[PDB]
Amino acid sequence: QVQLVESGGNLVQPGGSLRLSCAASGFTFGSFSMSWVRQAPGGGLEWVAGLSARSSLTHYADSVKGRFTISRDNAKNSVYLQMNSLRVEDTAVYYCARRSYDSSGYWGHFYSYMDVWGQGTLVTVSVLTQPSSVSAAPGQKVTISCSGSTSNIGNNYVSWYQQHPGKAPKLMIYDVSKRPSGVPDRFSGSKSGNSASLDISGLQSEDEADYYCAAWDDSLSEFLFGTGTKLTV
């Protein structure tokens, strides 16, 4: 039913340009805020650009301002990212993702979480702290901490994302402690002061993946991802 489908991943020479599309189906895209999130080789999740829901208001990460243009095409029910003056450090898989309805309104920054994710497309140009890794046997309990300061985790609600390598991230926990439909109750989320926790009881082999926390930061005025934790069973 509801999905986002990306297209346009290509190889470009340095200084070249490329346009990516993010097409919605099953819902009106303009009804939601949305973002582009990139992942460099060996890197974590990085917010790059986005649109506010009911306006056409844009913003961009500092590393990308002046070179990337985000726009909506309401006629095609889609969003585009025009990438000019591309650099080698721009090489990454780029995802688009919508922000939930419930985080697209007056308290959208407090709640900011992304429920529907694009497939990811590869462009080749040629301080939320988590443990590096955690491990346990199947059936064992695991805890993944996510630490910050007042501006991020202190003020805003935390979400958690599961990513098998090279695949689209998946929302596992939102608004600190909530699970979306279908996410098993083995997963639970916690917050206390400037730290949050993802607990996984009864480790299953399919849980082996990278896990990122995320929260809005009030001083940056930017959505932050954690450095990420590799979980092995």
Coordinates of N, CA and C in Angstrom, one line a residue:
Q1 N 0.8 -1.2 0.0 CA 0.0 0.0 0.0 C 0.9 1.3 0.0
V2 N 1.2 1.8 1.2 CA 2.0 3.0 1.3 C 3.5 2.7 1.1
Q3 N 4.1 3.4 0.1 CA 5.5 3.3 -0.1 C 6.2 4.5 -0.7
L4 N 7.5 4.5 -0.6 CA 8.3 5.5 -1.3 C 9.3 4.7 -2.2
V5 N 9.3 5.0 -3.5 CA 10.2 4.4 -4.4 C 11.2 5.4 -5.0
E6 N 12.5 5.1 -4.9 CA 13.6 5.9 -5.4 C 14.0 5.5 -6.8
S7 N 14.6 6.4 -7.5 CA 15.2 6.2 -8.8 C 16.3 7.2 -9.0
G8 N 17.3 6.9 -9.8 CA 18.3 7.8 -10.4 C 19.8 7.6 -10.0
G9 N 20.1 6.7 -9.1 CA 21.5 6.4 -8.8 C 22.3 6.1 -10.0
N10 N 23.4 6.8 -10.1 CA 24.3 6.8 -11.2 C 25.8 7.1 -10.8
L11 N 26.7 6.8 -11.7 CA 28.1 7.2 -11.6 C 28.3 8.6 -12.2
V12 N 29.0 9.5 -11.6 CA 29.3 10.8 -12.1 C 30.7 11.2 -11.9
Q13 N 31.3 12.0 -12.8 CA 32.7 12.6 -12.6 C 32.6 13.7 -11.6
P14 N 33.7 14.0 -10.9 CA 33.7 15.1 -10.0 C 33.3 16.5 -10.6
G15 N 32.4 17.2 -9.9 CA 31.8 18.4 -10.5 C 30.5 18.2 -11.3
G16 N 30.2 17.0 -11.5 CA 29.0 16.7 -12.3 C 27.7 16.8 -11.4
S17 N 26.6 16.5 -12.0 CA 25.3 16.6 -11.4 C 24.4 15.4 -11.7
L18 N 23.4 15.3 -10.8 CA 22.5 14.1 -10.9 C 21.2 14.5 -10.2
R19 N 20.1 14.1 -10.7 CA 18.8 14.2 -10.0 C 18.2 12.9 -9.6
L20 N 17.8 12.8 -8.3 CA 17.1 11.7 -7.7 C 15.7 12.0 -7.5
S21 N 14.8 11.0 -7.7 CA 13.4 11.1 -7.4 C 13.0 10.2 -6.3
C22 N 11.9 10.6 -5.6 CA 11.3 9.9 -4.5 C 9.8 9.9 -4.7
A23 N 9.2 8.9 -5.2 CA 7.8 8.9 -5.6 C 6.9 8.2 -4.5
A24 N 5.9 8.8 -4.1 CA 4.9 8.3 -3.1 C 3.8 7.5 -3.8
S25 N 3.3 6.5 -3.1 CA 2.1 5.8 -3.5 C 1.3 5.5 -2.2
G26 N 0.0 5.6 -2.3 CA -0.9 5.2 -1.2 C -1.3 6.3 -0.2
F27 N -0.7 7.5 -0.5 CA -0.8 8.7 0.4 C -0.4 9.9 -0.3
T28 N -0.8 11.1 0.2 CA -0.4 12.3 -0.4 C 0.9 12.7 0.3
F29 N 2.0 12.8 -0.5 CA 3.3 13.1 0.1 C 3.4 14.5 0.7
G30 N 2.8 15.5 0.1 CA 2.7 16.8 0.6 C 2.1 17.0 2.0
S31 N 1.4 15.9 2.4 CA 0.8 15.9 3.8 C 1.9 15.7 4.8
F32 N 3.1 15.2 4.5 CA 4.1 14.9 5.4 C 5.4 15.7 5.2
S33 N 6.1 16.0 6.3 CA 7.5 16.3 6.2 C 8.3 15.1 5.7
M34 N 9.5 15.4 5.1 CA 10.3 14.3 4.6 C 11.8 14.7 4.6
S35 N 12.6 13.7 4.5 CA 14.1 13.9 4.5 C 14.8 13.0 3.5
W36 N 16.0 13.5 3.1 CA 17.0 12.7 2.4 C 18.1 12.4 3.5
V37 N 18.4 11.1 3.6 CA 19.5 10.6 4.5 C 20.4 9.8 3.7
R38 N 21.7 10.1 3.9 CA 22.8 9.4 3.1 C 23.6 8.5 4.0
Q39 N 24.3 7.5 3.4 CA 25.3 6.7 4.1 C 26.5 6.5 3.2
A40 N 27.6 7.1 3.7 CA 28.9 7.0 3.0 C 29.5 5.6 3.3
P41 N 30.4 5.1 2.4 CA 31.1 3.8 2.6 C 31.8 3.7 4.0
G42 N 31.5 2.7 4.8 CA 32.0 2.6 6.1 C 31.4 3.5 7.1
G43 N 30.5 4.4 6.6 CA 29.9 5.5 7.5 C 28.6 5.1 8.1
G44 N 28.1 6.0 8.9 CA 26.8 5.9 9.5 C 25.7 6.6 8.7
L45 N 24.5 6.8 9.4 CA 23.4 7.6 8.8 C 23.7 9.1 9.0
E46 N 23.5 9.8 7.9 CA 23.6 11.3 8.0 C 22.4 12.0 7.3
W47 N 21.7 12.9 8.0 CA 20.7 13.7 7.5 C 21.3 14.7 6.5
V48 N 20.7 14.9 5.4 CA 21.2 15.7 4.3 C 20.3 16.9 3.8
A49 N 19.0 16.7 3.7 CA 18.1 17.7 3.3 C 16.6 17.3 3.6
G50 N 15.7 18.2 3.6 CA 14.3 17.9 3.8 C 13.3 19.0 3.5
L51 N 12.0 18.6 3.5 CA 10.9 19.5 3.3 C 9.9 19.4 4.5
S52 N 9.4 20.5 4.8 CA 8.4 20.6 5.9 C 7.0 20.2 5.2
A53 N 6.1 19.7 6.0 CA 5.0 19.1 5.5 C 4.1 19.9 4.6
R54 N 3.4 20.8 5.1 CA 2.3 21.5 4.4 C 2.8 22.8 3.7
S55 N 4.0 23.2 4.0 CA 4.6 24.3 3.2 C 5.6 23.7 2.2
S56 N 6.3 24.6 1.4 CA 7.4 24.1 0.5 C 8.7 24.5 1.1
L57 N 8.8 24.7 2.4 CA 10.0 25.1 3.1 C 11.1 24.0 3.1
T58 N 12.3 24.4 2.7 CA 13.4 23.4 2.6 C 14.5 23.7 3.7
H59 N 15.3 22.7 4.0 CA 16.6 23.0 4.6 C 17.6 21.9 4.3
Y60 N 18.8 22.2 4.6 CA 19.9 21.4 4.1 C 21.0 21.3 5.2
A61 N 21.7 20.2 5.3 CA 22.9 20.1 6.1 C 24.0 21.0 5.6
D62 N 24.8 21.6 6.4 CA 25.9 22.5 6.0 C 26.8 21.9 5.0
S63 N 27.1 20.6 5.0 CA 28.0 19.9 4.1 C 27.4 19.9 2.6
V64 N 26.2 20.3 2.5 CA 25.5 20.2 1.2 C 24.8 21.5 0.7
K65 N 24.6 22.5 1.6 CA 24.0 23.7 1.3 C 24.7 24.4 0.1
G66 N 23.9 25.0 -0.8 CA 24.4 25.7 -2.0 C 24.7 24.8 -3.2
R67 N 24.7 23.5 -3.0 CA 24.9 22.5 -4.1 C 23.7 21.6 -4.3
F68 N 23.0 21.3 -3.3 CA 21.8 20.4 -3.4 C 20.6 21.2 -3.3
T69 N 19.6 20.9 -4.2 CA 18.3 21.5 -4.2 C 17.2 20.5 -4.0
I70 N 16.4 20.6 -3.0 CA 15.2 19.7 -2.8 C 14.0 20.4 -3.3
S71 N 13.1 19.7 -3.9 CA 11.8 20.3 -4.3 C 10.7 19.3 -4.4
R72 N 9.5 19.7 -4.1 CA 8.4 18.8 -4.4 C 7.7 19.0 -5.7
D73 N 7.2 17.9 -6.3 CA 6.4 17.9 -7.5 C 5.1 17.3 -7.0
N74 N 4.1 18.2 -6.6 CA 2.8 17.8 -6.2 C 2.0 17.1 -7.3
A75 N 2.2 17.5 -8.5 CA 1.6 16.9 -9.7 C 1.9 15.4 -9.8
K76 N 3.2 15.0 -9.5 CA 3.6 13.6 -9.6 C 3.6 13.0 -8.2
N77 N 3.2 13.7 -7.2 CA 3.2 13.2 -5.9 C 4.6 12.7 -5.5
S78 N 5.6 13.5 -5.7 CA 6.9 13.1 -5.4 C 7.8 14.2 -5.0
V79 N 9.1 13.9 -4.6 CA 10.1 14.8 -4.2 C 11.4 14.5 -5.0
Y80 N 12.1 15.5 -5.5 CA 13.3 15.4 -6.2 C 14.5 16.0 -5.4
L81 N 15.7 15.5 -5.6 CA 17.0 16.1 -5.1 C 17.9 16.3 -6.3
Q82 N 18.1 17.6 -6.6 CA 19.1 18.0 -7.6 C 20.4 18.2 -6.9
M83 N 21.4 17.4 -7.3 CA 22.7 17.4 -6.8 C 23.7 18.0 -7.8
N84 N 24.2 19.2 -7.6 CA 25.2 19.8 -8.4 C 26.5 19.9 -7.7
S85 N 27.6 20.2 -8.5 CA 29.0 20.2 -8.0 C 29.3 19.1 -7.1
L86 N 29.1 17.8 -7.6 CA 29.3 16.7 -6.7 C 30.8 16.4 -6.4
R87 N 31.1 15.9 -5.3 CA 32.4 15.7 -4.8 C 32.6 14.2 -4.5
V88 N 33.8 13.7 -4.3 CA 34.1 12.3 -4.0 C 33.5 12.0 -2.6
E89 N 33.5 12.9 -1.7 CA 32.9 12.8 -0.3 C 31.4 12.7 -0.3
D90 N 30.8 13.0 -1.5 CA 29.3 12.8 -1.7 C 28.9 11.4 -2.1
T91 N 29.9 10.5 -2.3 CA 29.6 9.2 -2.7 C 28.9 8.5 -1.5
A92 N 27.8 7.9 -1.8 CA 27.0 7.3 -0.7 C 25.7 6.7 -1.3
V93 N 25.1 5.8 -0.5 CA 23.7 5.4 -0.9 C 22.8 6.5 -0.2
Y94 N 21.9 7.0 -1.0 CA 20.9 8.0 -0.5 C 19.6 7.4 -0.4
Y95 N 19.0 7.7 0.8 CA 17.6 7.3 1.1 C 16.7 8.5 1.2
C96 N 15.5 8.4 0.8 CA 14.4 9.3 1.2 C 13.5 8.6 2.2
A97 N 12.9 9.4 3.0 CA 12.0 8.9 4.1 C 11.1 10.0 4.5
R98 N 9.8 9.6 4.7 CA 8.9 10.5 5.3 C 8.9 10.6 6.8
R99 N 8.6 11.7 7.3 CA 8.4 11.9 8.7 C 6.9 11.6 9.0
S100 N 6.6 11.0 10.1 CA 5.3 10.5 10.5 C 4.3 11.7 10.5
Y101 N 3.0 11.5 10.2 CA 2.0 12.5 10.3 C 2.1 13.2 11.7
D102 N 2.2 12.4 12.7 CA 2.3 12.8 14.1 C 3.6 13.5 14.5
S103 N 4.6 13.6 13.6 CA 5.8 14.4 13.8 C 6.0 15.4 12.6
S104 N 4.9 15.7 12.0 CA 4.9 16.7 10.9 C 4.1 18.0 11.3
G105 N 3.7 18.1 12.5 CA 2.9 19.3 13.0 C 3.6 20.2 14.0
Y106 N 2.9 20.7 15.0 CA 3.4 21.7 15.9 C 4.6 21.3 16.8
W107 N 4.5 20.0 17.3 CA 5.6 19.4 18.1 C 6.5 18.5 17.2
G108 N 6.6 18.7 15.9 CA 7.3 17.8 15.0 C 8.7 17.5 15.3
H109 N 9.4 18.5 15.9 CA 10.8 18.3 16.3 C 10.9 17.4 17.5
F110 N 10.1 17.7 18.5 CA 10.0 16.8 19.7 C 9.9 15.3 19.3
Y111 N 9.0 15.1 18.4 CA 8.7 13.7 18.0 C 9.4 13.1 16.8
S112 N 10.0 14.0 16.0 CA 10.6 13.7 14.7 C 11.1 12.2 14.5
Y113 N 10.3 11.4 13.8 CA 10.7 10.0 13.4 C 10.2 9.7 12.0
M114 N 10.9 8.7 11.4 CA 10.6 8.4 10.0 C 10.1 7.0 9.9
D115 N 8.9 6.8 9.4 CA 8.2 5.5 9.4 C 8.4 4.8 8.0
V116 N 8.2 5.5 6.9 CA 8.2 4.9 5.6 C 9.5 5.3 4.9
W117 N 10.3 4.3 4.5 CA 11.6 4.5 3.9 C 11.7 4.0 2.4
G118 N 12.4 4.8 1.6 CA 12.8 4.4 0.3 C 13.9 3.3 0.3
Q119 N 14.0 2.7 -0.8 CA 14.8 1.5 -1.1 C 16.4 1.8 -1.0
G120 N 16.7 3.0 -1.3 CA 18.1 3.4 -1.4 C 18.7 3.3 -2.8
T121 N 19.4 4.4 -3.2 CA 20.0 4.4 -4.5 C 21.4 4.9 -4.4
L122 N 22.3 4.3 -5.1 CA 23.8 4.6 -5.0 C 24.3 5.7 -5.9
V123 N 24.9 6.8 -5.4 CA 25.5 7.8 -6.2 C 27.0 7.6 -6.0
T124 N 27.8 7.4 -7.1 CA 29.2 7.3 -7.0 C 29.8 8.4 -7.7
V125 N 30.7 9.2 -7.0 CA 31.4 10.3 -7.6 C 32.9 9.9 -7.7
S126 N 33.4 9.8 -8.9 CA 34.8 9.3 -9.0 C 35.4 9.8 -10.4
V127 N 26.9 13.0 17.1 CA 27.4 13.0 18.5 C 26.4 12.4 19.6
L128 N 25.4 11.8 19.0 CA 24.7 10.8 19.8 C 25.6 9.5 19.8
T129 N 26.1 9.2 21.0 CA 27.2 8.2 21.1 C 26.6 6.8 21.5
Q130 N 27.0 5.8 20.7 CA 26.6 4.4 21.0 C 27.8 3.5 21.1
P131 N 27.8 2.4 21.8 CA 28.8 1.4 21.7 C 29.1 1.0 20.2
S132 N 30.3 0.6 19.9 CA 30.7 0.2 18.6 C 30.0 -1.1 18.2
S133 N 29.9 -2.0 19.2 CA 29.3 -3.3 19.0 C 28.8 -3.9 20.3
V134 N 27.9 -4.9 20.1 CA 27.4 -5.7 21.2 C 27.2 -7.1 20.6
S135 N 27.3 -8.1 21.5 CA 27.2 -9.5 21.1 C 26.5 -10.4 22.2
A136 N 25.7 -11.4 21.8 CA 25.3 -12.4 22.7 C 24.8 -13.6 22.0
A137 N 24.5 -14.7 22.7 CA 24.0 -15.9 22.0 C 22.5 -15.7 21.8
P138 N 21.9 -16.6 21.0 CA 20.4 -16.5 20.8 C 19.7 -16.7 22.1
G139 N 18.6 -16.0 22.4 CA 17.8 -16.1 23.6 C 18.4 -15.2 24.7
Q140 N 19.5 -14.6 24.5 CA 20.2 -13.7 25.5 C 19.6 -12.3 25.3
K141 N 19.8 -11.5 26.4 CA 19.3 -10.1 26.4 C 20.5 -9.2 26.0
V142 N 20.1 -8.1 25.3 CA 21.1 -7.1 24.8 C 20.5 -5.7 25.1
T143 N 21.4 -4.8 25.5 CA 21.1 -3.4 25.7 C 22.1 -2.6 24.9
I144 N 21.5 -1.6 24.1 CA 22.3 -0.6 23.3 C 22.0 0.8 23.8
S145 N 23.0 1.4 24.4 CA 22.8 2.7 24.9 C 23.0 3.8 23.8
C146 N 22.5 4.9 24.1 CA 22.6 6.1 23.2 C 22.6 7.3 24.0
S147 N 23.8 8.0 24.1 CA 24.0 9.1 25.0 C 24.3 10.4 24.3
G148 N 23.8 11.5 24.9 CA 23.9 12.8 24.4 C 23.9 13.8 25.5
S149 N 23.3 15.0 25.2 CA 23.3 16.1 26.1 C 21.9 16.8 26.0
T150 N 21.8 17.9 26.8 CA 20.5 18.5 26.9 C 19.8 18.9 25.6
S151 N 20.5 19.4 24.6 CA 20.0 19.9 23.3 C 19.4 18.8 22.4
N152 N 19.8 17.6 22.5 CA 19.3 16.5 21.7 C 18.4 15.6 22.6
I153 N 19.0 14.5 23.1 CA 18.2 13.5 23.9 C 17.5 14.1 25.1
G154 N 18.1 15.1 25.8 CA 17.5 15.8 26.9 C 16.2 16.5 26.6
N155 N 16.0 17.0 25.4 CA 14.8 17.8 25.1 C 13.8 17.0 24.2
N156 N 14.3 16.0 23.4 CA 13.5 15.5 22.3 C 13.3 14.0 22.4
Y157 N 12.3 13.5 21.8 CA 12.0 12.0 21.9 C 12.9 11.3 20.9
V158 N 13.2 10.0 21.3 CA 14.3 9.2 20.6 C 13.6 8.1 19.8
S159 N 14.1 7.9 18.6 CA 13.7 6.8 17.7 C 14.9 5.9 17.5
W160 N 14.6 4.6 17.0 CA 15.6 3.6 16.8 C 15.4 2.9 15.5
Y161 N 16.5 2.7 14.7 CA 16.4 2.2 13.4 C 17.3 0.9 13.2
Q162 N 16.7 -0.1 12.6 CA 17.5 -1.3 12.3 C 17.8 -1.3 10.8
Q163 N 19.1 -1.6 10.5 CA 19.6 -1.7 9.2 C 20.5 -2.9 9.0
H164 N 20.1 -3.8 8.1 CA 20.9 -4.9 7.6 C 21.8 -4.2 6.5
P165 N 23.1 -4.5 6.5 CA 24.0 -3.7 5.6 C 23.7 -3.7 4.1
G166 N 23.7 -2.5 3.6 CA 23.3 -2.3 2.2 C 21.8 -2.2 1.9
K167 N 21.0 -2.4 2.9 CA 19.5 -2.4 2.8 C 18.9 -1.1 3.5
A168 N 17.7 -0.9 3.2 CA 17.0 0.3 3.8 C 16.8 0.2 5.3
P169 N 17.1 1.2 6.0 CA 16.8 1.2 7.5 C 15.3 1.0 7.7
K170 N 15.0 0.5 8.9 CA 13.6 0.2 9.3 C 13.4 0.8 10.7
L171 N 12.3 1.5 10.9 CA 11.9 2.0 12.2 C 11.5 0.9 13.2
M172 N 12.1 0.8 14.3 CA 11.8 -0.3 15.3 C 11.1 0.3 16.6
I173 N 11.5 1.5 17.0 CA 10.9 2.2 18.2 C 10.8 3.7 17.8
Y174 N 9.7 4.3 18.2 CA 9.5 5.7 18.1 C 8.9 6.4 19.3
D175 N 8.9 7.7 19.4 CA 8.5 8.4 20.6 C 8.9 7.8 21.9
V176 N 10.2 7.5 21.9 CA 10.9 6.8 23.1 C 10.6 5.3 23.2
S177 N 9.3 5.0 23.4 CA 9.0 3.6 23.8 C 7.9 2.8 23.0
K178 N 7.5 3.4 21.9 CA 6.5 2.9 21.0 C 7.0 2.0 19.9
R179 N 6.3 0.9 19.6 CA 6.7 0.0 18.5 C 5.6 0.1 17.4
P180 N 6.1 0.3 16.1 CA 5.1 0.2 15.0 C 4.5 -1.2 14.8
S181 N 3.4 -1.3 14.2 CA 2.8 -2.6 13.9 C 3.8 -3.6 13.3
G182 N 3.8 -4.8 13.8 CA 4.6 -5.9 13.3 C 6.0 -6.0 13.9
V183 N 6.5 -5.0 14.6 CA 7.7 -5.1 15.3 C 7.5 -5.9 16.6
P184 N 8.2 -7.1 16.7 CA 7.9 -7.9 17.9 C 8.3 -7.3 19.2
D185 N 7.5 -7.7 20.3 CA 7.7 -7.0 21.6 C 8.9 -7.4 22.3
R186 N 9.8 -8.2 21.7 CA 11.2 -8.4 22.2 C 12.0 -7.0 22.2
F187 N 11.6 -6.1 21.3 CA 12.2 -4.8 21.3 C 11.5 -3.8 22.2
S188 N 12.3 -3.1 23.0 CA 11.7 -2.0 23.8 C 12.7 -0.9 23.9
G189 N 12.1 0.3 24.1 CA 12.9 1.5 24.2 C 12.7 2.3 25.4
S190 N 13.7 3.0 25.9 CA 13.9 3.7 27.1 C 14.6 5.0 27.0
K191 N 14.3 5.9 27.9 CA 15.0 7.3 27.9 C 15.0 7.7 29.4
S192 N 16.2 8.3 29.8 CA 16.4 8.9 31.1 C 17.4 10.0 31.0
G193 N 16.9 11.2 31.2 CA 17.8 12.4 31.1 C 18.4 12.5 29.7
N194 N 19.8 12.5 29.7 CA 20.5 12.7 28.4 C 20.9 11.3 27.8
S195 N 20.3 10.2 28.2 CA 20.6 8.9 27.6 C 19.3 8.1 27.3
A196 N 19.4 7.3 26.2 CA 18.3 6.4 25.9 C 18.9 5.0 25.7
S197 N 18.0 4.0 25.7 CA 18.3 2.6 25.6 C 17.4 1.8 24.7
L198 N 18.0 1.0 23.9 CA 17.2 0.0 23.1 C 17.5 -1.4 23.8
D199 N 16.5 -2.1 24.3 CA 16.6 -3.4 24.8 C 16.1 -4.4 23.9
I200 N 16.8 -5.5 23.6 CA 16.4 -6.6 22.8 C 16.5 -7.8 23.8
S201 N 15.3 -8.4 24.1 CA 15.3 -9.7 24.8 C 15.3 -10.8 23.8
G202 N 15.6 -12.0 24.2 CA 15.5 -13.1 23.3 C 16.1 -13.0 21.9
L203 N 17.3 -12.5 21.9 CA 18.1 -12.3 20.6 C 17.8 -13.4 19.6
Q204 N 17.4 -13.0 18.4 CA 17.2 -14.0 17.3 C 18.2 -13.7 16.2
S205 N 18.6 -14.7 15.4 CA 19.7 -14.5 14.5 C 19.4 -13.4 13.5
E206 N 18.1 -13.2 13.1 CA 17.7 -12.2 12.2 C 17.8 -10.7 12.8
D207 N 18.1 -10.6 14.1 CA 18.4 -9.3 14.7 C 19.8 -8.8 14.4
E208 N 20.6 -9.7 14.0 CA 22.0 -9.3 13.6 C 21.9 -8.2 12.5
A209 N 22.4 -7.0 12.9 CA 22.3 -5.8 12.0 C 22.9 -4.6 12.7
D210 N 22.9 -3.4 12.1 CA 23.4 -2.2 12.7 C 22.2 -1.5 13.2
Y211 N 22.3 -0.9 14.4 CA 21.2 -0.2 15.1 C 21.6 1.3 15.4
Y212 N 20.8 2.2 14.9 CA 21.0 3.7 15.2 C 19.9 4.2 16.0
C213 N 20.2 5.0 17.0 CA 19.3 5.9 17.6 C 19.3 7.2 16.8
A214 N 18.3 8.1 17.2 CA 18.1 9.4 16.5 C 17.3 10.3 17.3
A215 N 17.6 11.6 17.2 CA 16.8 12.6 17.9 C 17.2 14.0 17.3
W216 N 16.2 14.9 17.4 CA 16.4 16.3 17.0 C 17.3 17.0 18.0
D217 N 18.2 17.9 17.5 CA 19.1 18.7 18.3 C 18.7 20.1 18.2
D218 N 18.3 20.8 19.4 CA 17.8 22.1 19.4 C 18.8 23.2 19.0
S219 N 20.1 23.0 19.4 CA 21.1 24.0 19.1 C 21.6 23.9 17.6
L220 N 21.8 22.7 17.1 CA 22.0 22.5 15.7 C 20.7 22.8 14.8
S221 N 19.5 22.7 15.4 CA 18.3 22.8 14.6 C 18.4 21.7 13.5
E222 N 18.7 20.5 13.9 CA 19.0 19.4 12.9 C 18.7 18.1 13.5
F223 N 18.1 17.1 12.7 CA 17.9 15.7 13.1 C 19.3 15.0 13.1
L224 N 19.6 14.4 14.2 CA 20.9 13.6 14.4 C 20.7 12.1 14.5
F225 N 21.6 11.4 13.9 CA 21.6 9.9 14.1 C 22.8 9.6 15.0
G226 N 22.6 8.4 15.7 CA 23.7 7.9 16.5 C 24.8 7.3 15.6
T227 N 26.0 7.1 16.2 CA 27.2 6.6 15.6 C 27.0 5.2 15.1
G228 N 26.1 4.5 15.8 CA 25.6 3.2 15.4 C 26.3 2.0 16.1
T229 N 25.6 1.0 16.3 CA 26.0 -0.2 17.0 C 25.9 -1.4 16.1
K230 N 27.0 -2.2 15.9 CA 26.9 -3.5 15.3 C 26.5 -4.6 16.2
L231 N 25.4 -5.2 16.0 CA 24.9 -6.3 16.8 C 25.2 -7.7 16.1
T232 N 25.9 -8.6 16.8 CA 26.1 -9.9 16.2 C 25.5 -10.9 17.2
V233 N 24.9 -12.0 16.6 CA 24.4 -13.1 17.4 C 25.4 -14.2 17.4

